[PDB]
Amino acid sequence: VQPLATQCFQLSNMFNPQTEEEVGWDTEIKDDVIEECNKHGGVIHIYVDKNSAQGNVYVKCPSIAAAIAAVNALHGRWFAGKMITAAYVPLPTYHNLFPDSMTATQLLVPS
């Protein structure tokens, strides 16, 4: 079936490294996704994989409810004719990839 929601997710189609042209684009994505999450349930870890051919961004939220809200805000937007899609990532998989996220529990809410 479709996998169950978790605290962690992967967005796809957020960018295309071959066509991005603005200096600082990957940080702009990071900061934008933080701002969007802070209109919903917040965020505790984020990584923009700027090398990814699939336009992947990785996010960990403080709860499953917060992740659902972020996923529902971001998926279904369209960039260059491709849809932003989300896949939930199992916690052990996410933590293997981003070990700094394992102990993070406070929200990224810019001062």
Curated annotation (Swiss-Prot):
Transmembrane segments: none
Compartmental location: Nucleus
Coiled coil: none
Domain of life, source organism: Eukaryota
Domain RRM: 28-91
Keyword vocabulary terms for this entry: Acetylation, Activator, Isopeptide bond, mRNA processing, mRNA splicing, Nucleus, Phosphoprotein, Repeat, RNA-binding, Transcription, Transcription regulation, Ubl conjugation
Broad class of the protein's primary localization: nucleus
Cellular component, GO, one term: nuclear speck
Region called Interaction with NCOA6, residue ranges: 1-111
Assembly behavior: Interacts with NCOA6 and JUN. Interacts with ESR1 and ESR2, in the presence of estradiol (E2). Interacts with RSRC1 (via Arg/Ser-rich domain). Interacts with SF3B1. Interacts with ZNF106 (via N-terminus).
Family of this protein: Belongs to the splicing factor SR family.
Function: RNA-binding protein that acts as a pre-mRNA splicing factor. Acts by promoting exon inclusion via regulation of exon cassette splicing. Also acts as a transcriptional coactivator for steroid nuclear receptors ESR1/ER-alpha and ESR2/ER-beta, and JUN/AP-1, independently of the pre-mRNA splicing factor activity.
Protein name listed in UniProt: RNA-binding protein 39
Organism: Mus musculus (Mouse)
Lineage of origin: Eukaryota, Metazoa, Chordata, Craniata, Vertebrata
Gene: Rbm39
